[PDB]
Scaffold this active site. Structure first.
Site, short mmCIF file in Angstrom:
data_model
loop_
_atom_site.label_atom_id
_atom_site.label_comp_id
_atom_site.label_asym_id
_atom_site.label_seq_id
_atom_site.Cartn_x
_atom_site.Cartn_y
_atom_site.Cartn_z
N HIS A 1 -4.61 7.31 6.52
CA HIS A 1 -4.34 6.20 6.11
C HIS A 1 -5.32 5.34 5.80
O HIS A 1 -5.41 4.58 4.80
CB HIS A 1 -3.79 5.42 7.26
CG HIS A 1 -3.08 4.18 6.98
ND1 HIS A 1 -2.37 3.84 6.06
CD2 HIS A 1 -3.46 3.03 7.58
CE1 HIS A 1 -2.07 2.37 6.15
NE2 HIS A 1 -2.84 1.84 7.13
N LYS A 2 -6.80 5.66 6.32
CA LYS A 2 -7.86 4.87 5.96
C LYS A 2 -8.65 5.60 5.02
O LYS A 2 -9.70 6.02 5.17
CB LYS A 2 -8.69 4.37 7.03
CG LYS A 2 -8.01 3.44 8.08
CD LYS A 2 -7.54 2.19 7.43
CE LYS A 2 -7.53 1.15 8.75
NZ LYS A 2 -6.86 -0.09 8.13
N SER B 1 -3.01 -1.21 3.00
CA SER B 1 -1.84 -1.47 4.10
C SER B 1 -1.20 -2.92 3.83
O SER B 1 -0.49 -3.03 2.52
CB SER B 1 -2.58 -1.26 5.22
OG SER B 1 -1.27 -1.45 6.23
N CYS B 2 -1.09 -3.96 4.58
CA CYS B 2 -0.48 -5.11 4.16
C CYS B 2 -1.09 -6.03 3.07
O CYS B 2 -0.54 -7.03 3.01
CB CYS B 2 -0.29 -5.88 5.61
SG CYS B 2 0.80 -4.78 6.70
N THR C 1 -6.09 -5.29 5.63
CA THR C 1 -4.81 -5.36 6.20
C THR C 1 -4.84 -6.28 7.59
O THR C 1 -6.09 -6.79 8.16
CB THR C 1 -4.37 -3.98 6.56
OG1 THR C 1 -2.97 -4.27 6.62
CG2 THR C 1 -4.83 -3.47 7.79
N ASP D 1 -0.97 10.24 5.12
CA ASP D 1 -0.88 8.95 5.74
C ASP D 1 0.14 9.22 6.91
O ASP D 1 1.53 9.25 6.66
CB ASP D 1 -0.58 8.01 4.94
CG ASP D 1 -0.77 6.52 5.45
OD1 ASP D 1 -0.30 6.27 6.59
OD2 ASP D 1 -0.98 5.35 4.64
#
Lengths: 256, 256
Positions: free
Chosen positions: A234-235, A79-80, A10, A206
């Protein structure tokens, strides 16, 4: 079965985020490529040189361009990174066996490319100690950011060990969402991006891509398959590395 | 007692090598700075821009220059970082409480600055799959290198886990020893570098800075204190992180 996985970090991150998952996938027999995108990780460019999410995606496009005919990969974006996946699939869809979204944005084809980023910013408006700046490239003002260390600690790396959070403090760089450039970009295509198989992996624990957001994305653009990982943060490629490898093995055995 | 430790990576590496040790030292109450030297880690320069070991040292010198009067640090250098220590001590000796050599080169004041590098290259001549190139800067031909992944695996990261070796594969960069530039550099001074307290930490299971080399260095230029760490590998800050912290605590309690 074995696959070639292409791991896509990300914004503000680099290949290094995949340092636990890559050897584990290799231990299952897969080929793994973990790229640094433009101005990320040890890539030599600085963000102020990059004018769009497409330009940010160059190393991924170049890597795909280098695959000989007939070779297909499974993209894995965190993520992104889902936006890098969509950009890549509109150029190289024939080289993509499947795409795996890993607590990732999930762009669609009916709304503009910024749509799920705009929504993310509504669900998670307060980026804590993150700092912002502006630069100009190709006549547009771009908002850069540097992820705040409290945000990193509390929201992205919540359950990660101190030695992993340390890597994030050491290695995260200035980056950009290129939100206003995405907002004016041609839509992702149905024939390219829309055609690829999409596997959505997430955890409801998350603390930045919150459940309201991720569940909103799943209803907005139905994935071919959803996997929910229990626990972690999140990771997930750090906190649930084995579970992610397990899921990716199944994806490799399902999609080619 | 608490100290401010300044951790100095070796060529082709970056602050990231200290990602386990830095939080451990902080957990003992210390302040820790882990720098990226020029063209290292996420520093924006490329090696071809750097003309000497002194120029490579700039981030360390700049950091020392920024310490307010009266503040002293303990420098900790791994592998080639001992040469950055010597360069720094000839400019900022009054700001150095002590220097800790961590499987590091140990320059002296009676021989030219390249002396211990020349010896290293005699003891360990075969760098396996390491690749070399040349570039020109300030009228001199400089030999650059990129550490080979087999060398990394077998000789530097011998007992490190796969996720640590992965970081090395991902993050190590082109660098240089600047051996021929060191060979023509003014000698390290007795008043600066020679005056600082020097603590030499090593393991006899280092597979690149072999015992013949490290023991030769200790006899060549007697340290103020020697600590031998049993076991581990060249990257003691990964394989013996707690033992290194233990030693650094004692150094902080001994030297100010």
């Amino acid at each position: 079965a074995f696959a070639h996985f292409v791991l896509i970090h990300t914004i503000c991150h680099g290949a290094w985020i995949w340092h636990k998952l890559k050897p584990l996938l290799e231990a299952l027999g897969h080929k793994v490529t973990a790229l640094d995108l433009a101005a990320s990780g040890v890539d030599p460019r600085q963000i102020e040189e990059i004018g769009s999410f497409d330009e940010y995606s160059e190393p991924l496009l170049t890597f795909l361009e280098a695959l000989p005919p007939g070779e297909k990969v499974i993209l894995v974006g965190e993520s992104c990174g889902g936006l890098n996946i969509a950009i890549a699939a509109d150029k190289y869809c024939e080289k993509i066996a499947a795409a795996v979204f890993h607590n990732s944005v999930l762009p669609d084809t009916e709304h503009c490319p910024s749509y799920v980023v705009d929504k993310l910013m509504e669900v998670f408006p307060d980026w804590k100690d993150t700092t912002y700046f502006t630069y100009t490239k190709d006549g547009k003002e771009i908002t850069g950011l540097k992820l705040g260390f409290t945000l990193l600690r509390e929201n992205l790396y919540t359950l990660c060990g101190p030695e992993e959070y340390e890597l994030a403090k050491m290695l995260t760089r200035k980056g950009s969402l290129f939100q206003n450039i995405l907002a004016k970009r041609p839509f992702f295509t149905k024939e390219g991006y829309g055609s690829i198989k999409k596997i959505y992996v997430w955890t409801d624990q998350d603390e930045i891509f919150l459940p309201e957001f991720q569940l909103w994305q799943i209803e907005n653009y139905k994935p071919d398959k959803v996997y929910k990982v229990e626990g972690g943060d999140h990771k997930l490629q750090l906190t649930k590395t084995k579970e992610i490898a397990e899921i990716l093995q199944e994806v490799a055995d399902t999609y080619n």
